[PDB]
């Protein structure tokens, strides 16, 4: 069975860095554009969706308008890749990466964003 | 105009012992393509039925859902991905995720409530 696996199901990050959060999928031979939807969402807000070879921007919630993108280069390699630019305590939580590719899987996972310090 | 589940009931008050019968209904413009087309059921990570491809897995599903749940196949061609869970008990009280893909993709959740078995 299709399975998506996380190298990591806990990030802990600074206040104000980037993160960059990662959903492995297997890809034998080239990437299909076309059978793939890659879906990130936190606690039901719409992170990114990537339908068919293509970001859709209009469901996106409002919150991460121009914070969060897909690392398209990454895909290719079996890995859905999530940045969020400029954390805030906000983004604390648990992420749920979804991915339908001749099969389907997610994964959880948590994000710890501690206070400003550095 | 994305693809867009949706449930008739987000809530289920069953019976004890009953029979449930969960809907997540998914457009189906035309005819049905089975080879396109997932649907998963879980409840607090339990695998309860996955069909990819045309065919049940039943491999992965969890021990505690063997006898007991099914996916009622004839529904799926009306755009309805309908679970049945047979006997119902205080155990099957929960949150139930349903997980579509067909053309885009979507779930959606349902809560069940199991009220008590009677003394009668
Ligand atoms: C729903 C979805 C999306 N979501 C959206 O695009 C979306 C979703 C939601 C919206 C927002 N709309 C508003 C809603 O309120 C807007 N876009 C994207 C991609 C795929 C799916 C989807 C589809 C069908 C089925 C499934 N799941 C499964 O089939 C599944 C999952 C997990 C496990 C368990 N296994 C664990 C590993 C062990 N593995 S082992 C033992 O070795 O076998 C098993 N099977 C998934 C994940």
Redesign the pocket.
């Given at each position: 069975?299709f399975?998506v696996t996380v190298p990591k199901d806990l990030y802990v990050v600074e206040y104000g860095s980037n993160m960059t959060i990662e959903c492995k999928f297997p890809v034998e031979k080239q990437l299909d554009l076309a059978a793939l939807?890659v879906?990130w969402?936190m606690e039901?807000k719409?992170i990114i969706?990537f339908?068919h070879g293509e970001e859709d921007l209009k469901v996106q919630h409002s919150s991460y308008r121009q914070r969060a993108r897909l690392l398209k280069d990454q895909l290719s390699l079996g890995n859905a890749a999530l940045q969020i630019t400029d954390v805030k305590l906000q983004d604390a939580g648990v992420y749920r990466c979804?991915?339908?590719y001749g099969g389907?899987?997610?994964k959880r996972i948590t994000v710890k964003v501690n206070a400003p310090y550095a």
């Open positions: 069975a399975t939807i879906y969402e039901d719409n969706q339908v979804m991915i339908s389907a899987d997610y």
